[PDB]
Amino acid sequence: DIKVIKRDGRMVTFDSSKIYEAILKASETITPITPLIETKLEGIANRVVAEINDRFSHNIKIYEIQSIVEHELLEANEYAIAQEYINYRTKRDFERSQTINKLVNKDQAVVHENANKDSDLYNTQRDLTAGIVGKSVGLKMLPPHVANAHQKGDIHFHDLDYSPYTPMTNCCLIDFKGMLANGFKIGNAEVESPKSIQTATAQISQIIANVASSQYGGCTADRIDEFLAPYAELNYKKHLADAKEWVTEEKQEDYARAKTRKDIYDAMQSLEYEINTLFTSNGQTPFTSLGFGLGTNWFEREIQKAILQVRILGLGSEHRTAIFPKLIFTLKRGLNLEPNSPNYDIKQLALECATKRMYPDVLSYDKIIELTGSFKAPMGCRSFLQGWKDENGVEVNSGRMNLGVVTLNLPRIALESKGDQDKFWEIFEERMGIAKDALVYRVERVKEATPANAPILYQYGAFGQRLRKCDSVDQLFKHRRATVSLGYIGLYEVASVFYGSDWETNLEAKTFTLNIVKAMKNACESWSDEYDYHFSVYSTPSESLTDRFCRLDTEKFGVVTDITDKEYYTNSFHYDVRKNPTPFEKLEFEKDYPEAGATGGFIHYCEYPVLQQNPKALEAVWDFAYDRVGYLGTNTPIDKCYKCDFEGDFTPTERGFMCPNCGNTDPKTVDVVKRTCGYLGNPQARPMVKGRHKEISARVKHMNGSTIKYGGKHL
Amino acid sequence: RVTVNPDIKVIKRDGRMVTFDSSKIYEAILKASETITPITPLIETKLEGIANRVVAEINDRFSHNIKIYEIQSIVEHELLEANEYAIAQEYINYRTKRDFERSQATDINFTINKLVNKDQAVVHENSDLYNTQRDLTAGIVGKSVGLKMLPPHVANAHQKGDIHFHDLDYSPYTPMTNCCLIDFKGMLANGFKIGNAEVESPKSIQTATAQISQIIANVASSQYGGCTADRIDEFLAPYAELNYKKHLADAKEWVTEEKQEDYARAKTRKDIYDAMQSLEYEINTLFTSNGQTPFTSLGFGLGTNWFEREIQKAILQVRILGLGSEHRTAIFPKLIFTLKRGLNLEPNSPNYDIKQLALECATKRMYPDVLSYDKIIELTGSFKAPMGCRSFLQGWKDENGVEVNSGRMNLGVVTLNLPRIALESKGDQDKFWEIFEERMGIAKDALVYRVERVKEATPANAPILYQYGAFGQRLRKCDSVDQLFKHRRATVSLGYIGLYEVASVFYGSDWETNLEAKTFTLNIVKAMKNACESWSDEYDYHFSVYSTPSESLTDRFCRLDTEKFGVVTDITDKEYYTNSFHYDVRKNPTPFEKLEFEKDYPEAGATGGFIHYCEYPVLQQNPKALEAVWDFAYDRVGYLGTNTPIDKCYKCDFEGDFFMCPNCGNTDPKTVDVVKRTC
Ligand SMILES: Nc1ncnc2c1ncn2[C@H]1C[C@H](O)[C@@H](COP(=O)(O)OP(=O)(O)OP(=O)(O)O)O1
Ligand SMILES: Nc1ncnc2c1ncn2[C@H]1C[C@H](O)[C@@H](COP(=O)(O)OP(=O)(O)OP(=O)(O)O)O1
Ligand SMILES: Nc1ncnc2c1ncn2[C@H]1C[C@H](O)[C@@H](COP(=O)(O)OP(=O)(O)OP(=O)(O)O)O1
Ligand SMILES: Nc1ncnc2c1ncn2[C@H]1C[C@H](O)[C@@H](COP(=O)(O)OP(=O)(O)OP(=O)(O)O)O1
Ligand SMILES: Nc1ncnc2c1ncn2[C@H]1C[C@H](O)[C@@H](COP(=O)(O)OP(=O)(O)OP(=O)(O)O)O1
Ligand SMILES: Nc1ncnc2c1ncn2[C@H]1C[C@H](O)[C@@H](COP(=O)(O)OP(=O)(O)OP(=O)(O)O)O1
Ligand SMILES: [Mg+2]
Ligand SMILES: [Mg+2]
Ligand SMILES: [Mg+2]
Ligand SMILES: [Mg+2]
Ligand SMILES: [Zn+2]
Ligand SMILES: [Zn+2]
């Protein structure tokens, strides 16, 4: 290892952190450290070490290290941190021997957190430029008042990187049943109907990879155990015919049964791994959901079991938690909910999986039907289609899509209200009109698409009906077949402005938040009659919005107590994550909001401790939730550090998450899984924005218990 | 007066190694001083004393080369040692100003705002998928940024059409590499991380081929060129053997002892076919950010045992059968079959049955192309399949004396517009070699730049390549990627095109029979070979002569020359340039005549990339005729591709070469199967 020559002459040992901490001090003079800046600095620090060993062999001087640090800062295009580092380092060199320049424009004086030349994948880097062009051109395509409201922060026009630059749609339920049945053309090949479940799960992932790049939202395989089971019956028939030729007569049925079991497991094992190797143009994996649970026969049951035990096993030899696809298990009274039900053994398997992998989320078969008019898994994260029938009276769920999302900054309306609820509704009506204009423009823009733009969607069965190149894409959107999302956020903050930080026990406060949801549902019903598309109230995931709205409102209104001071906004109608109600009180409080009109999109979370050796505690919440809420997710500490074998809940810091036992943050040797919003995420692999990270750090547990499964060893 | 170590060379910012020149240091210090006070003899004495301390420190801190910023660091250091704080302040301020402005030429936010507003150009060509439409804007930005990053004389040469700097959409904006031979054998044996999964070694051939298609997808997004699975029948065989091992174990529990061996054999043969079927269909459903299928190749043929033979047959059987119910011809991956005397060449050879199958496949489809095992060894120093289209690695032993082929890559291509040089000569070969020497130097500056650019890549920019085995050795995040490029490990491509047009300028249309006309074209290849060998000794990367594929480059050079020189007879009047050294496409020599004429050019030094095309009417639907060409080619050329298959109209059921359809006139690509070579 190379030694370092100090300025006085003595030789010290190469301490790599002296480079990082130097760069850190220069960055902190511009803006406080964040998880995103942390990985940016660590990547730049690695390049410095690389250049040092590439340009020097036995020793290196201090000023030689300084010239590499400044050189690598300019090679990474970090002009703001470089200007600070160079001026300070130069000032100290002049002082030891006895500002220097200004060369950065207003837009380069800020640290760009989502752009790391030394850390990002190539396709991530090039797609970044496509998104900048797309957003810039897209802002001029919008109606100017809609574009102005987005820029100010009154509303949020979602997915500007993709829409309206392209007439892309949002999310959808892929009609896998129709596609796999008749075959389809994908890429250069036009495959035929699969003759086994292995070929079927292979075609599914290839369909997902294609759908993921024809739309800016997620996609779901609804009732996968049911449409996959016929292809697993082909496997049984195969193995049964093979048993006639080779196997003893007394063993032919056990042979075909045992081989088909392994085939089903291998097919779902392939679906798990292949989805985790797929990626869109930005380098990130596709946002995918698998829904299952309503199958009853042996093949449908085995597919359910194989999905869960694959997720339980984990990815690779380290058995890491699979973040994608999202698994959604359907609970149904009489099928798997009661201990006497035939599929109850699968419910106990899904309970084991949720205590080890957080997934699966659970749907209430009946409550979903009541809230949304029919049963289906949510499109992507949490978007629900409403009950809809075709011209022949046939119920149609899979094959339907969402056309776009626009979200209202509700806390802003409360902060502009100055404690006057009459002024709140006055501003609320104005903001609703802007959102209506934005949503109508989205519908017009998506209708300008052509079947040739996304053949997998419009021509080969993903949207249910196959169109010709001459047909209009609106044929699959009109008559309320497609949905349009009117989003919102921060009902807690809206109530805190008028009723204080402990309004949850105030009925008049609760009524206010419920009347806001009903008002949005009322307008959506009116818009749905005006334009004959299904507008619905959507509980927007706070993955990026919680930071953007809180950041823009802090500039406009300052540090408002309980609102902007915490640096995040509470998601939709959710309970204040800082308070600690029981999971039973939480679901009883929140259940009123989807019933009031928030049915276009919704979810419920609960924070548990380590539940791996206590699944019945989780089962009491699922059973309690069946009659009250439709979509329930389970959060439980399932992190793991592979340096000291610690398992539990990592301690959040200003830079991300570190091991509570040894302080390890290296994502190569830690498995940190947190619920971003609906989906799970790896905050050590892809760090979240500061606001999203603050909201995650503010979450308290809802039932007592230990957040440590394995304490770890002393290193 | 201190003398610099003569073993030290200055590495310019664009990668060029130049002679050390202490006057460059003195003049720099002088320019900073003149901004403060006029020069005086007393100041000169101080400035040349400082320059001496700079050269002494250089000799004290570096042994072989030194970068520009390392010299500047010493200049600023010694200025502060000499207590010339006024000069040092002016020098640092000016040097830092130029360093920032130089980095801002790679900034997107500056140029994207200009692209959408005022001065930057968008339409620069002289497509329905959304990801294609979004990728167009990424390439517009990349080409606009890339042109400002290149050395100015390289950019001017490219825009004028004197050279072609390949893949401006991707490099130098990103430090991406070009093509490679993926080291599948190392990845599959030791496991690897891909996406979010740290997968283990495959326990079956079905899992092996599934991991291959996913590796290919991830590699295809980490580079702008093709990738190749070399000797796929051989490294897949150990995984097909695992299928046999577990089938024989199941046979012991379910099958009677008399049938146990036949059970494991039959099931394993089916598993092999199913696995290769998946590889075929999964490759065709892959796509890069532009929506196109990644260019991929499978090389196979040298396997001998039962498992290797079955993998070869399965590959050819799947390709023969076609894609889908209509049995369309699969264009990707390219199949490259290895002929070898004693293994499958002559009718008595053990694998001759596979050659017969390959001949049937190449006739009914287009692929497999064939490689002469012996000729490739003679031309490239060792045996390996071409990376991507036709890029060949040279024979290379690693630091442990082991021959390495898979895991190596090409760093970029720059193609000389040779027909233009001939037209600029005005009939005088003396001016040709004069202009040829100049264009040669410009291409050298561009290739040196590409190597310097790809070395800026970090392992984290492409973990599948640098960290998880695609390039052989696995690097850490704090290592340099150059470890996998240097010591001639990676190749650099010097391209050319249009030897027919060049000779025709000085010798007329029918020069092929002129002995001195061919000697001239062969001297052009030899001049390129010798230059590349010299560049390889200078920079320690393998520069090689590359017969650039025509693609769209043959239209860019011809279109730009038509604007510059007009309609020249036999040159630009046909609206295309003949590829590299190939025989005139308008002339119709026999396959044996064509191969005898063309074999000299790889032998002359065009070995970094080459292929031989034969399009003879007798070869259509005639496996016997094709075998005559393969056999004749084995001892003469190294890489041969035969006829394209008949274009099929699925309506009206016509077969021919047609675009429209002679029997009806259909143009719908859904009911039409047209097969063309990508390169
Ligand atoms: N042991 C070391 N290993 C690697 N880099 C080092 C080491 N010590 C110092 N550096 C580098 C990192 C910075 O680029 C540069 C200045 O860092 P700094 O910690 O202030 O060093 P220093 O020698 O001035 O120490 P101090 O300020 O504590 O006296 O020196
Ligand atoms: N306030 C700051 N602004 C910008 N960069 C800073 C700041 N503080 C520290 N740094 C960076 C640049 C310094 O070279 C490096 C090491 O810090 P420091 O020890 O203060 O400086 P130094 O090593 O140049 O001088 P010295 O050791 O003589 O104090 O950290
Ligand atoms: N891995 C794959 N990915 C995508 N398509 C595939 C894959 N393997 C096969 N296909 C295509 C080829 C056919 O057009 C269609 C049916 O495949 P498959 O179920 O393997 O039937 P098959 O006709 O090859 O019969 P079998 O495998 O049962 O002998 O799917
Ligand atoms: N051949 C060389 N020998 C020694 N030092 C050199 C050489 N070329 C450049 N330098 C050093 C001297 C200065 O400290 C620094 C910048 O000098 P300069 O002549 O402007 O280089 P350059 O590569 O930027 O060229 P130019 O500005 O002419 O294009 O580089
Ligand atoms: N006007 C000046 N004031 C101060 N120092 C100067 C001035 N002109 C030149 N120098 C010094 C510092 C420069 O690094 C060095 C070489 O000059 P110059 O080639 O113009 O700069 P450079 O090499 O940093 O940039 P460029 O990228 O344009 O080559 O001489
Ligand atoms: N279709 C697939 N695509 C990608 N990786 C896969 C796929 N199937 C399995 N893998 C991964 C999982 C393991 O880490 C590794 C080995 O897979 P595999 O050979 O199926 O082993 P295994 O442990 O599942 O045993 P077996 O299949 O014999 O029961 O590859
Ligand atoms: Mg210091
Ligand atoms: Mg397996
Ligand atoms: Mg200069
Ligand atoms: Mg098959
Ligand atoms: Zn630890
Ligand atoms: Zn026809």
Author numbering:
A (entry chain B): 14 to 111, 118 to 734
B (entry chain A): 8 to 133, 138 to 669, 676 to 696
What did the published study say regarding this structure?
The most unexpected feature of this dATP-bound StNrdD crystal structure is the asymmetric arrangement of the cone domains compared to the dimeric protein core. The cone domains, which form an antiparallel dimeric unit, are tilted so they contact only one side of the core fold, the side of the NrdD dimer that contains the opening to the chain B active site within the 10-stranded barrel. The chain B cone domain sits close to the top of the chain B barrel, not only burying a relatively large surface area near the barrel edge (525 Å2) but also making contacts with chain A across a chain A–chain B interface (left side of dimer in Fig. 2B). Here, the C terminus of the cone domain helix 4 is pointing in the correct direction toward the chain A active site, but the chain A cone domain is sitting on the opposite side of the NrdD dimer from the barrel opening and is thus too far away for the connector to reach the active site (right). The asymmetry of the dATP-bound structure is therefore part of the mechanism of inhibition.
The activity of NrdD enzymes can be allosterically up-regulated by ATP and down-regulated by dATP. We find that StNrdD’s regulatory “cone” domains adopt markedly different conformations depending on whether the activator ATP or the inhibitor dATP is bound and that these different conformations alternatively position an “active site flap” toward the active site (ATP-bound) or away (dATP-bound).
